[PDB]
Amino acid sequence: MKTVIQDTADVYFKRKSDGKLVFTAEAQTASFSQAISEEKLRGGIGNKPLYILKSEKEINLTVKNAFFDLEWLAMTQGSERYEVEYRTIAYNPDTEEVYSDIYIQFPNVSPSGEFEMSLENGNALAPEIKFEALADTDTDEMAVVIEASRD
Amino acid sequence: MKTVIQDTADVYFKRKSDGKLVFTAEAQTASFSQAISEEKLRGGIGNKPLYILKSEKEINLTVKNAFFDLEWLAMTQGSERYEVEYRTIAYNPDTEEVYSDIYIQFPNVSPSGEFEMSLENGNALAPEIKFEALADTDTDEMAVVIEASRD
Amino acid sequence: YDYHFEVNGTVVRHKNKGFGYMERFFELKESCDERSKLSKKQYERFNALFNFFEKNGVICMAKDAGTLNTSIEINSLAYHGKYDVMKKFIEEQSVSIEDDYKKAFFLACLGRWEESYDLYSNIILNSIDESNGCVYYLSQINRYRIYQSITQAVTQFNGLGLLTFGRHYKPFTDEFLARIEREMTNFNIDDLFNGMPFEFQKKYKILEFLSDNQFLYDDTVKLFELTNKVRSEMSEGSYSFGMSSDIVVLLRLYDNLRFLYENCLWSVSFHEFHQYIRNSMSLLIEKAEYERTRDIDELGFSFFGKKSGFFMEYYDFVNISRHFKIDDIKNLERSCSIDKIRFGEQEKIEEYLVGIAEEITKQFSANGMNVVFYTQFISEAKAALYFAKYVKLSEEGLGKIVKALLFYFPERDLDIGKRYVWLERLTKCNELPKSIISIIDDFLVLQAEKHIDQNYSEVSSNGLYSRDYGALIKHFEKNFISKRLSEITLCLTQDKQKQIDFLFKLLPLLSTNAKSHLLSFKSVENINDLMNGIRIGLIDEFTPEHEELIIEYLETRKVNYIVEKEKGIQTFSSNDYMSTFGIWYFLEEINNSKMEEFIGMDDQYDFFVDPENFDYKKFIPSWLKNYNDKLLGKIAGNKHMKHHVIEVLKERVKNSNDKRYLEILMNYFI
Amino acid sequence: YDYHFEVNGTVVRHKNKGFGYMERFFELKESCDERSKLSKKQYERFNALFNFFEKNGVICMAKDAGTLNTSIEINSLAYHGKYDVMKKFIEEQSVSIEDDYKKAFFLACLGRWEESYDLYSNIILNSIDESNGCVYYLSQINRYRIYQSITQAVTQFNGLGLLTFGRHYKPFTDEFLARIEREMTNFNIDDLFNGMPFEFQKKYKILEFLSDNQFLYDDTVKLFELTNKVRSEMSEGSYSFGMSSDIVVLLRLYDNLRFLYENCLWSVSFHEFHQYIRNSMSLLIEKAEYERTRDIDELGFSFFGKKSGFFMEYYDFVNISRHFKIDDIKNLERSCSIDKIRFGEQEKIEEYLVGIAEEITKQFSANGMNVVFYTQFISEAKAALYFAKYVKLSEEGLGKIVKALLFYFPERDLDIGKRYVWLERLTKCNELPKSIISIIDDFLVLQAEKHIDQNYSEVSSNGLYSRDYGALIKHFEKNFISKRLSEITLCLTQDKQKQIDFLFKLLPLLSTNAKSHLLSFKSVENINDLMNGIRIGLIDEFTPEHEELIIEYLETRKVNYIVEKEKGIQTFSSNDYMSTFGIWYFLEEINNSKMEEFIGMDDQYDFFVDPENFDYKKFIPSWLKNYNDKLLGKIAGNKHMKHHVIEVLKERVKNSNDKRYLEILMNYFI
C-alpha cells in the first residue's frame, strides 16, 4: 500500500494447420523489443529509380513460465513455425476500471534458445526462452492488433 | 614479459613557517582532478559589464601510503597549511631513456578527509587521503611546474 | 528449501514431493467457514500464524496472484533521526531483557561508544537465565562490530585525525581498550553459529548469514546481476511488462533496511553496507530518466501506459540524506536531470531538515561535542542540506536552515567559500523573503566584527567572499542599503586598514554618506584595485593613467617570461588575469595598439588577439564553457574564427557526452 | 594472512611481527654470492623455490618495485581450440594417475560427457592408494559438476529441445541416468572439504574456495567494486598514476582464467563463469573508448603523449570469441568505435579463425552430429564469424570461411536472410577477389535448384531473400554473367511459378538471351511484381497504367481500413506500402492528384502527401532513420517541413545519446 503496485499479463502460443496450443502462459520477464535500422548495403544505386524503405526491422520476444503441456507434448513425443497470440488488459487512468483488453497476434514465430543453462546451483525452473518472428514473401506479418474499450 | 606495463609516482607534503617534511613515496590511485564550470551569476544591469571572469576552478588530490613520518607524529602524539610537492619523470617515446623529470608545487592544500572509513574487516591498510586545492585572495598559488629534460 | 519465496510475497513450489502444506494454508486463508472448523486452540494458532505472515507480507500463491500492492513501513526511531527523544529513552529504567537490547543499539547511535560495550557486557551475563535463544547471539554479533569500530577508530585518530583536527583527541580511556583487546583477542567470527546448541541450530538456522561476511557478499552479487541486465535493455529500447527488473531491487532494498534496523543491529554504520545503498538507489534514479525520454510506435505506451515516475517518497529522501558523500551526489547530478523529478510528502520531509538543523544548534552552540558522534553525523548533515534545493520548504524551515548553516556549522569541513555555493543553492526553487534577508545580514555583521584579526585572510576554495552574499541579496532585493555595516565604517580611522579590503569589497552595501567616507578614505594604486574596483562596476572606463598601470604589470611578466624560458621552466598561474586581459581587446574596451607587442606567451591570450596568425591546434575546447552569453555572441559574429571554431566544436559534440557543449553549439553558432 | 600479495607481482607485509621470513628470500634472489654459501641440497631447495616463483611471477618486494611487466602465457589445448590434436592424445594409453586427469578434462571439452564419468569413476578408486589427495579431491569437484550438467541437459532436451531441434533425442542411455540419479542423491558439495584428512586440511587450504560457489562470489564482488570506481573515473575526468584501477581488472581477468584452464577444472563451461568474463572484459573495452576521446586541459601531453592505445591482441580475441553471445557483441557496437581500435597479432588470428571453419565442415559433413558437443560449440562458433569483420584475413584463409558459412552451417541457427548479413559483414575489411565470387555464385545456383518443389517456401528475419544476394555481386563486381544461371533459365520450360519469380528478381546477373526469353511469360504487373520489378531496374518510369494499379491498392487498403476501424483492429505490415507511395509523390514521381482522397489512413502517409496540413505532433522521429540523403536534402528545402522537423531533432539529441539523430542534424538541416 505504501509503494509498489503490480499488474499482470498473459502469453499463449499456438501451431498452424490445427488448433494445437502447446506452450507457456505467463511471461514473467515478458521482455519485448522492437527495432529498425539501416546501413550501406545499398551504398550506391543506378539512380533515376525510387526507393525501397527497407528498414530491416526485427521483433524480439521473451516469455518465462514453462509448463508447456502434457497431452500435446506427449503426442508430439510420438516446419509450420507456429503462431502467437498476446492478450493484456488496459485500464483508464481517470477511473481505473476494466473496460478494454489488448488483442495482439503475431503471424510467424521461431523459438531459438541458448540450449545451455549449466548454472552452478540449480534454479527454480522458469526456463526463459527467446523468440524471433519470421516472415514470408506474401504480405502483412509482424503483428495484427485488436482493441476492446467499446464502452 | 608479454603485456601490461606499470609506472610509479612520488608525493611530498610540508607545512609553512618551515620545511617540515611529510610524504607518501607512492600514490597508486593518486587521482588528480581539475574542474571548472559555472551555473549562473551577475545582476545583468548597468549596461556595460566591462568585465566577467568567474571560473570557480578547483583541484582535488589523492595519494596512498602507510607512512605518516616517524618523529613528530609521536611528538604531537602525546593550521599553517599542508603544502605538497608532486614529483615524477617523463620518458621519450622515441628512445624511452631517462631524460626528463616533473616537479609539481602546491602552496595551499587542505586535508578534507572522510573520517568515517570504518570498514567491515581488517584491511591491508590503504589509508587513502584526499585533498582540495585552496587559493587565497592574494595571488598565484595552486599549481607551478618544473621539469627536467635539459639535454 | 521445500518452497521458494519470491521477493513480491508470492510463493512457488520448489522441492515438495508431498502435501502442499503451504497451499492448504492459503486455501485456509480465504475460507472463513473452514477457519471455523478448528478448535479454539487451533484457531488461535492460525491467528498467531496469520498475524505473523501479514506482518511478513506473504499474501497468496503465485497461481492466484492478483494485483499485489505490498506495503513498506520503517518504524525504527534512528531511521527517523529523532536524536532528542532517544536521549530521554536511555535515561528511562529497564523493564525486560528485550528492552536492554533496544537501549544498547540506541547508545551507539549517539557516539557514546564507551558505555555501549559494558552494557553489551552487562546484558550477556544475565541473558541465559531467561533461556531466550536469540537475545544472546545477536548481542555478540553486535559486540565484535562495535569492537572493530573502536579499533578502527583509535588508529584513525592517531594516523590522520590529528591532521584533520589538529589535536590528539582521546575518546576512549587507555584501560578500556586493554580489556576489549584481551577478551576478543583470538575471536574468529566464523565458528559462532558452529558453537550454539543443536537446539539453537534447528530453530535459528535463518540467522546464520550474519556470522561471516557472506551476508554482505550474498546480497551485492544479485545487484550486479540485476544491474547488468537493466543497462542492457536500456540500450535495446525494450519494454518489460508486469514487474520490471528495477522494481525488484526496490523491494529488495527496503527489505534489507527493515531487517537491518528493527532488529537493532549495528552493521548500518559501516562503510561496506553503505556501498549497497549507493549502487541500488543510483540504478533506480538512473532508470527513471530513460523512461521519461524514448519513442514509441503505437503499442509502447499500450504496455504499462503509466509509471511510478520514480515518485520519490519520504523514505527515499531519508535514504539519500545519509548514505551519500557530497562527491557521490554530484556524480548523479551530471547524468540525470534531478530538477525534473517531483517530490511528494513535502511536509513530512520538513521535520527531517529542521531535525538535522536544530540538532546542529545543540552540538556546537554548547562547548560539548561528542567527537565520536561528529565522525558519523557530520557527513549526514552535509548531504541533507545540499539536496534540499529540489524540495519546496516552508518559510520557517528556511528560517532555521539558513540560520544554522551560517552561524553554527564548523568552518573546517565547510570554508566560507563553499558556503556561498550552498546558501545560493537553497534559493533556486524558492524566493528570499525579508525574514531570510535579515538572517544573512546577521552573518555579515558577525563577520564584520571578525575583520579585526591581524593575520586572517579568508582562505577559500571557490574565490567567493561575504561581499557576494551581499551581492546575492541585491540580485533579488536591489534596494537593501545596509544599516549596521555603515556604522562600523564611520567609527574607523585610516590607521587600522586591513578591513579596507572587506568594506571596499562590500561597497555595494553602504549609506550615501558612508560611501563618501570611503571616497576620501581608501586608494587605488594596484591591479586588484582595478578589477576589484571593476568587480562592482564602479570603474566605467580606463583613463590613460589607468592604462599605464595595465602596461606596467605586463612589463613585469615578460621580464620573468624570458627568465623561465632561459631556465627551462614553465608555470601555470592560478588566477592569471592575462587571460582576462586578452578578453578586453576583442571586446573593444581597450583599442590601444601597444598590446600587440605582448603576444606569444599565453595561448588563451593569443586566441583572442591575433586570429590572423593564430594556430588552432593550441585551442582548449574547455575555454568556451566559461564564456558569456554576450561574449559567445561577439565571437559568433566574427568571420575569421567562426568556421574554425565550428570545426573544433562539431568534433567534440560528436565524440563526447557533455551536454553543455551540445546546447552551446545549437543556440548561438546555429 | 601474514603478508599481502598485490596483483602487480609485489608483496607487502600485513600481519607479520616475527622475522621477515618472506623478506629475506628475495634478498637472496638479488645477491649472487649468498646463493653459493648454501649447501647443495639447500642450494637445490633454493632453486626448487626459485623456479616456482618464476612460474608464478612473484617478482620483487614493493619497497624496491619498479616498472613491472608481467607475462601471460596460457598453454592448455582447450584454450587454444586445437580440437583436432585432442583426438590424437586421447587415443593413447596413460602412464600415470596424473595423465588420466588431463584426459578426463579433454573428454569433457569434446562433449562426450558419457565416457567422462566412467574415467572419472576409474580415478576415484585408483586414487585412494597413494599419498597425494590432490587428484582425489579435484576428482570429485569434476565428478559432481559433470553430474549437474547431465541433469541440466537431459531436462532441457525434454523441455524445449523438441520445438528447438524439431525432434526427440536421447544421447544418454536410460540406465546411466538411473545410475547417476542413484549415486549422487545423498551428496552435499559444501561438506566435501570438511571430511578430508587432517593433513589434507592443513597443506592445501588454498583449494578451499573451489569447494562451494563462494569463489565466484568473492571475486564477483571485487569486480563490482572496481566497476564502480572505473565508471566514477569516467564522469569525473580524473587521472590515475601508478597501477591504474583498470589494469587491475585485466590482470585479475587473466590470472583467474589461467588457474581454471591450466589445472583442468571443468567449471569453465558454466554460465556463472562466463558472467565474470563478460563484465570484466566489456568494462576495459569501454575504458579504451573514453581514453581516446579525452579533451586535454593542461597535463596529459607531458604525461601521456602519443597515446599508448589498448591493443586487442590474440589473447584478447579468443575470450570475446568464446564467451559472448550474439546479442551481447551487438551491444558493444552501439557503445564503442570498435572499428578504430587496432587489432594486433593479425597473423595469429587467421589460424584460429580458420580453425572453426574446418571443424564446422567435419561435424555436419559426417552423418554424426554429437548433439551434446553441438550445444557448447555453435555459440562459440557463431560469434567467431561475426567478429571477424574487425580483423584482416588473407585471400586463401578467406576462401575457407566463406565456403563454410554459406554451405555447411545448418539452417537452424542461420536463416537464409541471416546468411547474407554475415557474408557482407566480412566484405567490409576485405575486398571481393575472383575466388570469393565463385563461392557466393555456387550458393545461388544450389539454392536455385532446390527451389523447385511447390512448397519449399523461404522465411526471413530480415525480409531480404535471394534478391540482394545478387546485389552484393554487382555492388562489387560489374560484369558477372552467371553461366550456370544461364543453363538454368535456358532449360526452364513452363509452369514453375516459384522458380519463375525466384530468378525473376535475379535479373541483373542474367545473360542477354536468357533475359528476353525470360521477359516472355513474365509476371504481368502485380503490385508486388511492380515494386520488385522496380527493384531490378526493369521499370524506369511509371506509366499511368502502372499508376492505375497503385490506385487499386489504395482502394483495397481503404475498404480494409473501414472494416478494421469498425472492429477496432490495427496492423503493422512488413509489406506496408502506404509509406512508400507518399514519398514518391513528394519527389513528383507520380503526378495524379487522387492521393489526397486517402489522407488520414496511415500517419506516415500524411507526413509526405499533405505537408501543409500534417499533424506534426503525430510525427514519429524514427522515420528519419529510414530516409536516404536524396530525401534528406529534399526534406530540408520544403517550407512546410523545415519549421517543425528541426525542433523534434533538437529534443531527442539533447534527450538521447543517439548519434544518428545528431548526424542527420548537423549535415543537412543546418
- CA distances for C79 relative to C74, C101, C260, C312, angstroms: 7, 17, 11, 17
Q: Which residue of D has its CA nearest to B89?
A: D303
Question: How many Å lie between the alpha carbon of D462 and the closest alpha carbon of chain A?
Answer: 5
The grid coordinates listed for C574 are 592560478
Amino acid at D474: K
Answer positive or negative: Cα dihedral of C586, C591, C597, C602. Answer: negative
The count of residues in chain A is: 151
Instruction: Using alpha carbons, select from C127, C8, C117, C116 the residue that is nearest to residue C56.
Output: C8
The grid coordinates listed for C637 are 559574429
Answer positive or negative: Cα dihedral of C107, C112, C115, C116. Answer: positive
Question: How many Å lie between the alpha carbon of D2 and the closest alpha carbon of chain B?
Answer: 11
The count of residues in chain C is: 670
Give CA–CA dist D437/C386, Å, rounded.
67
**Element containing residue A35 per DSSP (H, E):** strand A31-35
The interface residues of chain B toward chain D in range 91-120, judged by CB-CB distance below 8 A, are: 93, 102
Report chain B's C-alpha Rg in angstroms.
Answer: 20
Give CA–CA dist B121/C214, Å, rounded.
12
Amino acid at D463: G
A148/D572 Cβ within 8 A: no
- CA distances for C420 relative to B124, C382, C447, C472, angstroms: 39, 14, 14, 9
The alpha carbon of C462 is separated from its chain's Cα centroid by a whole number of angstroms, namely 18
Asked whether the beta carbons of D114 and D172 are under 8 A apart, the reply is yes
B chain contacts of residue C568, beta-carbon cutoff 8 Å: 147, 149-150
Strand partners, D101: none
Give CA–CA dist C544/C535, Å, rounded.
20
The interface residues of chain A toward chain C in range 48-77, judged by CB-CB distance below 8 A, are: 60
- CA distances for D295 relative to A137, C622, C623, angstroms: 51, 8, 11
DSSP string, C330-347: HHHHHHS-GGGS-B--TT
Please indicate if any CB of chain D lies within 8 Å of the CB of C376: no
Long-range CB contacts (within 8 A, 24+) of D607-614: D607/D582, D608/D582, D608/D583, D609/D582, D609/D585, D611/D586, D611/D638, D611/D640, D611/D641, D612/D640, D614/D640
Give CA–CA dist D142/D148, Å, rounded.
10
Asked whether the beta carbons of D100 and D122 are under 8 A apart, the reply is yes
DSSP string, D322-372: HH--HHHHHHHHTT--TTTS----HHHHHHHHHHHHHHHHHHHHSS---HH
Residue A18, Cβ density class (10 Å: 0-12 exposed, 13-18 middle, ≥19 buried): exposed
Pairing of strands A83-91, A11-14: antiparallel
Asked whether the beta carbons of D334 and D289 are under 8 A apart, the reply is no
- In which residue are the cell numbers 500464524 written? C49
The grid coordinates listed for B98 are 631517462
Give CA–CA dist C314/B27, Å, rounded.
42
Instruction: Using alpha carbons, select from C75, C71, C35 the residue that is nearest to residue C55.
Output: C71
Other CB atoms within 10 Å distance of the CB of residue B102: 19
Closest in A38, A44, A58 to D475, CB measured: A44
Touching chains C and D? (3+ Cβ pairs < 8 A): yes
Pairing of strands B98-106, B83-91: antiparallel
D313/B3 Cβ within 8 A: yes
Touching chains B and A? (3+ Cβ pairs < 8 A): no
Give CA–CA dist D447/D407, Å, rounded.
10
C236/D331 Cβ within 8 A: yes
Other CB atoms within 10 Å distance of the CB of residue C335: 14
Instruction: Using alpha carbons, select from D506, D594, D495, D607 the residue that is nearest to residue D551.
Output: D594
Question: Within D80-161, where are the H helices?
Answer: 83-90, 97-109, 113-127, 134-156
User: How large is the angle between the packed helices C21-30 and C40-56, nearest 10 degrees?
Assistant: 100
Asked whether the beta carbons of D22 and D13 are under 8 A apart, the reply is yes
DSSP string, C486-550: HHHHHH--TTS-TTHHHHHHTTTS--HHHHHHHHHS----SHHHHHHHHHTT---S--HHHHHHH
Answer positive or negative: Cα dihedral of C252, C258, C261, C265. Answer: negative
Asked whether the beta carbons of C472 and C422 are under 8 A apart, the reply is no
Asked whether the beta carbons of D473 and A41 are under 8 A apart, the reply is no
Give CA–CA dist D372/D170, Å, rounded.
10
**SS3 state at D12:** strand
Question: How many Å lie between the alpha carbon of A109 and the closest alpha carbon of chain C?
Answer: 18
Asked whether the beta carbons of A81 and A16 are under 8 A apart, the reply is yes
D653/C620 Cβ within 8 A: no
Nearby residues of C211 by Cβ (< 8 Å), 6 or more positions away:
C141, C189, C190, C192, C193
Touching chains B and C? (3+ Cβ pairs < 8 A): yes
Instruction: Using alpha carbons, select from D284, D364, D362, D276 the residue that is nearest to residue D322.
Output: D276
Please indicate if any CB of chain D lies within 8 Å of the CB of B30: yes
Method of determination is cryo-EM
Other CB atoms within 10 Å distance of the CB of residue C155: 12
Give CA–CA dist B4/D57, Å, rounded.
13
Instruction: Using alpha carbons, select from A111, A114, A102 the residue that is nearest to residue A134.
Output: A111
Nearby residues of C585 by Cβ (< 8 Å), 6 or more positions away:
C591, C595, C608, C609
Q: Which residue of D has its CA nearest to C648?
A: D295
Asked whether the beta carbons of C154 and C172 are under 8 A apart, the reply is yes
- CA distances for C497 relative to A112, B139, C468, C525, D33, angstroms: 84, 20, 21, 15, 73
Other CB atoms within 10 Å distance of the CB of residue D308: 10
Give CA–CA dist C16/C26, Å, rounded.
16
The interface residues of chain C toward chain B in range 96-125, judged by CB-CB distance below 8 A, are: none
> Side-chain half-sphere of D12: how many Cα atoms within 13 Å?
14
**Rounded (5°) CA angle C581-C587-C589:** 75
Please indicate if any CB of chain A lies within 8 Å of the CB of C295: no
Asked whether the beta carbons of C305 and C257 are under 8 A apart, the reply is no
The count of residues in chain B is: 151
Question: Within C77-112, where are the H helices?
Answer: 85-89, 97-109
What phi, psi does A144 have (nearest 5°)?
-130, 120
- In which residue are the cell numbers 611481527 written? D17
How many Å from the N-terminal Cα to the C-terminal Cα in chain C? Answer: 65
Instruction: Using alpha carbons, select from D226, A147, D180, B137 the residue that is nearest to residue C305.
Output: A147
Pairing of strands B109-111, C11-13: unpaired
Strand ranges across the sheet with B98-106:
B13-14, B83-91, B98-106, B144-147
Instruction: Using alpha carbons, select from A26, A98, A108 the residue that is nearest to residue A68.
Output: A26
Q: How many helices (H) and strands (E) does chain A have?
A: 1, 8
Give CA–CA dist C522/C536, Å, rounded.
15
Answer positive or negative: Cα dihedral of C577, C580, C585, C588. Answer: negative
Nearby residues of C504 by Cβ (< 8 Å), 6 or more positions away:
C518, C522, C532
* Burial D403-418, CB ≥16 within 10 A → b, else e: bbbbbebeeeebbbbb
- CA distances for D268 relative to C489, D258, D318, D324, angstroms: 80, 11, 14, 14
Give CA–CA dist D611/D638, Å, rounded.
9
The grid coordinates listed for C371 are 567527537
Asked whether the beta carbons of A108 and A84 are under 8 A apart, the reply is no
Other CB atoms within 10 Å distance of the CB of residue B21: 12
Amino acid at D127: S
Question: How many Å lie between the alpha carbon of C646 and the closest alpha carbon of chain D?
Answer: 11
What phi, psi does B110 have (nearest 5°)?
-115, 140
Give CA–CA dist C520/C644, Å, rounded.
51
**Element containing residue C3 per DSSP (H, E):** strand C3-5
Residue D228, Cβ density class (10 Å: 0-12 exposed, 13-18 middle, ≥19 buried): middle
Question: How many Å lie between the alpha carbon of B132 and the closest alpha carbon of chain D?
Answer: 14
**Element containing residue C422 per DSSP (H, E):** helix C416-423
The alpha carbon of D643 is separated from its chain's Cα centroid by a whole number of angstroms, namely 43
Give CA–CA dist C593/C551, Å, rounded.
11
Give CA–CA dist D483/D480, Å, rounded.
9
**SS3 state at D393:** coil
D463/A135 Cβ within 8 A: yes
The count of residues in chain D is: 670
- In which residue are the cell numbers 503496485 written? A5
Amino acid at D576: D
Other CB atoms within 10 Å distance of the CB of residue C320: 22
The grid coordinates listed for D613 are 496540413
What phi, psi does D602 have (nearest 5°)?
-115, 135
Closest in A118, A121, A140 to D571, CB measured: A140
> Side-chain half-sphere of C103: how many Cα atoms within 13 Å?
22
Question: Within C387-415, where are the H helices?
Answer: 395-407
Question: How many Å lie between the alpha carbon of D174 and the closest alpha carbon of chain A?
Answer: 16
Give CA–CA dist B59/D260, Å, rounded.
44
DSSP string, chain B: --S---------EE-TTTT--B--S--SS--BEEE----------SS----------EEEEEE--S---SHHHHHTT-----EEEEEEEEE-TTT--EEEEEEEEES-EEE---S----SS-------EEEEE---SSS--S-EEEE----
Nearby residues of D395 by Cβ (< 8 Å), 6 or more positions away:
D433, D435
Give CA–CA dist A141/C297, Å, rounded.
16
The interface residues of chain D toward chain A in range 248-277, judged by CB-CB distance below 8 A, are: 267, 269-272
Q: How many CB pairs under 8 A join B and C?
A: 152
Give CA–CA dist C488/C122, Å, rounded.
60
Please indicate if any CB of chain A lies within 8 Å of the CB of D563: no
Q: Please report the resolution in angstroms.
A: 4.3
Interface test with A, best of C15, C16, C73, C240 (most A CBs within 10 A): C240
Q: Which residue of C has its CA nearest to D272?
A: C225
